[PDB]
Structure formats: C-alpha cells, structure tokens
C-alpha cells in the first residue's frame, strides 16, 4: 500500500557497471563510446544514451 | 505526396537463410551521430575494452 | 501533463530577426516584432499570444532569452524548446523536488548535454485539513513535458 | 637529397583581419556559446564582437 | 618599395609544407545546426576567424542578415575542412587531404 | 598625432607623413537638454583618394531608429567562399551557376 | 522611500503615507548604439487626483 509508482526499468543488477552501463537515471549511459575525437567528451552527454 | 518508411528485407526476400536483422537496427542507427572512421575505431576499441 | 496551447495563440518560429534593439520611451528595449502584423512590442508585457517554437538556442542572446521568458510570464507566451534532451525522474509528493532548474539554465544548457528534470505525480496527495489556513497566493509552474 | 621544404602544422596566412573597437560600446568580457560551438565559432565571434 | 620587395621575397620563398595539425571531430549533436552545416567532420583547433562564422551568432542583426543573405546565395558557400581525402593505392591509408 | 601644415609645406620630398582620420560614425549623441559647447572643430588637411581601402567591415553595432547604421560595411561574399581546390591545385571560387 | 503594498493595505486609517513620484520628463536619452537593458520598471500605486 502507498506505492505511488511501479515502473519497469532495465535491470541494473544485470546490466552492471562491468558492462560499462549506468542506469542511475532512467536510460542506459555508457561513457567513452561515441565521443568527440581530440577533445574531452562532456559529462552527462546525450550521446551516452 | 509520398510516405517514407523503413521496409525490412524479410518482407521481400522469401528465403530466411540470408536475412538476420530487422528495422530495429536502422532505428538504432538513426539514433547515432555521424561517425568518422577514427570515431568508429574508437567505439570498437571501447567495446573491446 | 502537457498543457494545450489555447485558442487565440499564433505560432511563431523563433528566429533572431524577430527580437532586436529599439528605442522605446527613452530606453533601448529588446523589442519583439510579431510577423502576422509586423508590429513591434518593446515591452514583454502587452505582447500578442505567441506559441513560439524554438528549434535551436544557438545564438540566442541572454537579453533575448530572458525577454522571451518574461513574455512567457507577463504575456502568457507559450514557448516550446525542441532543442532540449532530458531524463525525467518522477517524484512522489513526499520526496518533493531535490533539483531546482532556473529558467536561465534551460535557456543556456549546451546542446547535446542531457538535462535531468523531475516531475511530480501528486496523485497520492491527501486532502487538506478542513481548518488549515487559506493559501492567499498561488502555486505556479513553468516547465512541462512535450511528450508522454 | 635536399631540404627542399619546411614542414609546419597550422599555417599562417599572409593577410589577416585587424579590428579597431569603439571602446565605449564594446564589452571587454570574452563571449561564449556552447563549448563545442565555441571551439569553432569562438575566435571569430570574439574578433568581430 | 623595399618593404614590398621583401614581402615579395618572403612570399617567393614560402617553402612551407603543411602537415595536419591538432584537430577535432565534434559530435554532430553538440553543434548548433548553422555551424554544423559549415563543418565537415574534422577541423584544425586553430580555427582562424572568418566572417561566415558570425552567421546566427552575432547580435548585430543587420550584419547577420547580410551574411545570411550572402551565404544563402548560390554563388558562395562557406565550409570548414577536412574535405578532400586521398588514400594510397596499396597501403589504403590516407595521404594528402584537403582542409 | 597632429601634422602641422608647416611640416606638410616645408618637408623634403620623400618624407612619409602619417595622417590620422577619425571615423565619426560612432560618435555619441549629445543630451537633448545639455547647453551648447563653445568652439568649432576644423580639419585643414584632406586625402585626395579613398583612405580606407582595406575596410573589410564597418560599424558592427545596432541602431534603434534604423535597421542598419548608415555607412555600415558588410563583409564581401568572396571573404567567405571557401571554394575548392582545382585538380591543378589552383584555388577556385564556387561556381556562380550550374555548368 | 518605497511604500510596500502590504502597509498600504494593512495600515490603520489615519496613517499618513508619503508616496514619491519621479517626473521623468528630464530622463537622459540612451545612446543610439548601446545594447538593451534587461528588466522592466513597474509602478504599482497611483494617485487618484492630480
């Protein structure tokens, strides 16, 4: 009782950080795959999705 | 007066031996940034990592 | 909840050519000109209802961004920023809003950075006590989703 | 057989843009956009400020 | 006159041979579209100035209107290299490249 | 720097004078109520030829009353046509038309 | 001096307020080229009489 919401997320426990995923916000986010070359990629970049 | 749309090869070829994927790959590619060959090498080396 | 744009509103694609400087009552006001009539409106107040789409916040100057937002308030402009990309945490009413988005941050966040917005699902919010004091002022809200 | 040339990376042209500012109307603060766009458009926007 | 002579001399002997320098391949999503149309994958980090870049970025509206009109003419088109690329016939690696 | 007419008249041929020239387009407008100044500015020496032959641009500034300041100079279209490298390696402007 | 609308609304009858009023006829004219100011001046209280 009192469950305001019941969502269906990707399993964080399965798509672990060992896979380089970060499911802390709703989407998968993997750093340093699709990146600018020759300059550091910005943090919280949408490309990570 | 036209309607652009993805059309899976499975709907035109009958023989299933030579078809692997679906429209889904095309959709996910449409999600990607335009990629330099150097960038592509980067994604590959990262997936290896 | 995405509020409907009301009846009298005129869609206007944002463009730099619209907002401009102009003399107006001994001041250099950031005048907006309305393309349906071409009339100039130096003050954010008194402007015609405007569903202003904004495909890109590229060169948009702070005076202009701020003037647009001022038009959203003082003149009930409904602006739609399509440039933004965001994750959206959905808060229960008890957890409230851990984050706090200034208008300026939504009008200046770099393109391609992921914004992170929070949205209340206030459905699980209990009725006010019958003798709780009246709330004189209003509770207002500016940021809305464009999609489910 | 000859030191025929002189390798250099980011060549400087023979012509250039000088620019006199009217200091009363100019703000000396460096202007900027998004860092990606600023990396490119930046030096120019700063010269014809 | 002497000045011009040395200028003419210095240009006569500009034996400089360009090698690709430090560059960038910004991700397409991070670039404001008017910039993105100008750009072609990579670019030197030493972007020089060019007035065509003021387009949709200068606050001086007449200037932006004029530059936009010129850049929308069929007779002219701004760009930022890289552009042309030439691989070896055998190694298949890139060699000379326009920019 | 001020060039005395004395030196302009009595110098040996081959001296290279350095005249200055205010561009008064951006001079501030006087307050509407302020009392008149006493005195009159006077220029004695003038060019016979246009002086600003290197002027790419002029008055990169907005004006309230008018869409562009009078005498503002936009950059030339040629300043921005990145063009192409011809196969011979000579540079080319973009074609003005197909064919 | 600024008269808060709070005091204008909640004061006892017989308080004697001291409103100020700019006469803007002699306000300086802005430079023709200077960039626009951000913000809007707003007056909330007005006289009913000259």
From Swiss-Prot, chain F:
Family that this chain belongs to: Belongs to the turreted BTV-fold inner capsid family.
Shown part of the complete sequence: 1186 to 1284 of 1333
What does the record give as the function of this protein?
Inner capsid protein that self-assembles to form an icosahedral capsid with a T=2 symmetry, which consists of 120 copies of VP2, with channels at each of its five-fold vertices. This capsid constitutes the innermost concentric layer of the viral mature particle.
Q: Where does it reside? A: Virion
Q: Which organism is it from?
A: Bombyx mori cytoplasmic polyhedrosis virus
Subunit notes for this chain?
Answer: Homodecamer; each decamer is made up of two conformers of VP2, called VP2A and VP2B. 12 homodecamers assemble to form an icosahedral capsid.
Q: List the protein's name.
A: Inner capsid protein VP1
């Amino acid at each position: 009782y009192g469950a305001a919401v019941v969502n269906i997320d990707l399993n964080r426990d399965f798509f672990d950080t060992a896979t380089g995923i970060d499911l802390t916000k709703g989407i998968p986010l993997v750093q340093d795959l699709l990146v600018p070359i020759g300059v550091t990629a910005g943090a919280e970049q949408s490309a990570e999705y | 007066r036209y309607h652009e749309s993805v059309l899976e090869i499975a709907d035109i070829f009958d023989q299933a031996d030579f078809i692997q994927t679906s429209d889904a790959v095309r959709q996910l590619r449409a999600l990607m940034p335009t990629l330099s060959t150097s960038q592509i090498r980067h994604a590959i080396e990262r997936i290896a990592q | 909840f995405v509020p409907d744009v009301p009846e009298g509103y005129v869609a206007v694609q944002y463009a730099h050519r619209l907002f401009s400087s102009s003399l107006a009552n001994k001041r250099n006001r950031v005048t907006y000109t309305h393309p349906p009539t071409g009339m100039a409106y130096p003050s954010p107040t008194g402007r015609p209802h405007v569903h202003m789409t904004i495909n890109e916040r590229a060169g948009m100057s702070k005076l202009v961004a701020d003037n647009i937002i001022a038009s959203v308030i003082k003149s009930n402009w409904v602006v739609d920023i399509l440039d933004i990309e965001y994750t959206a945490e959905v808060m229960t009413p008890s957890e409230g809003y851990t984050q706090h988005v200034d208008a300026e941050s939504i009008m200046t966040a770099p393109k391609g950075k992921l914004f992170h917005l929070q949205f209340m699902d206030g459905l699980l919010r209990p009725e006010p006590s019958a003798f709780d004091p009246p709330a004189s002022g209003e509770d207002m809200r500016l940021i809305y989703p464009l999609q489910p | 057989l000859s030191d025929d040339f002189k390798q250099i990376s980011d060549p400087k042209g023979y012509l250039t843009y000088s620019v006199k500012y009217e200091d009363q109307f100019t703000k000396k603060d460096k202007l900027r956009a998004s860092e990606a766009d600023d990396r490119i458009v930046g030096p120019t926007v700063n010269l014809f400020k | 006159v002497s000045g011009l002579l040395m200028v003419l001399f210095k240009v006569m002997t500009d034996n400089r041979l360009v090698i690709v320098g430090e560059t960038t391949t910004p991700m397409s999503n991070t670039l404001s579209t008017v910039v993105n149309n100008v750009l072609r994958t990579t670019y030197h980090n030493n972007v020089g100035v060019n007035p065509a870049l003021l387009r949709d970025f200068t606050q001086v509206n007449w200037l932006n209107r004029d530059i936009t009109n010129m850049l929308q003419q069929a007779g002219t088109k701004y760009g930022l290299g890289l552009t042309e690329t030439r691989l070896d016939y055998v190694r298949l690696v890139k060699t000379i490249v326009g920019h | 720097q001020h060039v005395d007419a004395e030196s302009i008249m009595t110098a040996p041929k081959g001296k290279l004078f350095h005249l200055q020239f205010m561009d008064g387009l951006l001079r501030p407008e006087p307050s509407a109520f302020d009392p008149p100044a006493s005195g009159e500015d006077m220029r004695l020496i003038y060019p016979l030829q246009p002086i600003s032959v290197a002027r790419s641009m002029r008055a990169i500034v907005n004006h309230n009353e008018v869409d562009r300041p009078r005498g503002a100079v936009a950059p030339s279209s040629y300043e921005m046509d990145t063009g192409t490298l011809s196969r011979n390696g000579d540079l080319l402007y973009s074609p003005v038309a197909n064919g």
